[PDB]
Amino acid sequence: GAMGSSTSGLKTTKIKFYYKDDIFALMLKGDTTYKELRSKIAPRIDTDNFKLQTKLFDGSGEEIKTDSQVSNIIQAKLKISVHDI
């Protein structure tokens, strides 16, 4: 353990997405990007056009749309919400 980084952001981040009434979970090793997540949810959505946000509590939050928003939901483990678009 501990060797210059050793999983800087703890281990894989567990992020539960909320596509419609169904929900799943993704494990980001820290490199997951916004486009990588897009190809990781597309098949878990059943569509190629969807939107991801920082599932807060009322409905959704920051609409993840950049490798930083995802790596942020990765360092903060934010529930993600998926909508069909």
From Swiss-Prot:
Residues 12-85 form the PB1 domain. It comes from Saccharomyces cerevisiae (strain ATCC 204508 / S288c). Interacts with AXL2 and BUD5. This is Bud emergence protein 1. The lineage of its organism: Eukaryota, Fungi, Dikarya, Ascomycota, Saccharomycotina. It comes from the Eukaryota. The chain holds residues 472 to 551 of 551 of the full protein. Present with 6490 molecules/cell in log phase SD medium. It is found in: Cytoplasm, Cytoskeleton. Necessary for cell polarization during vegetative growth. May link the cytoskeleton to morphogenic determinants on the cell surface.
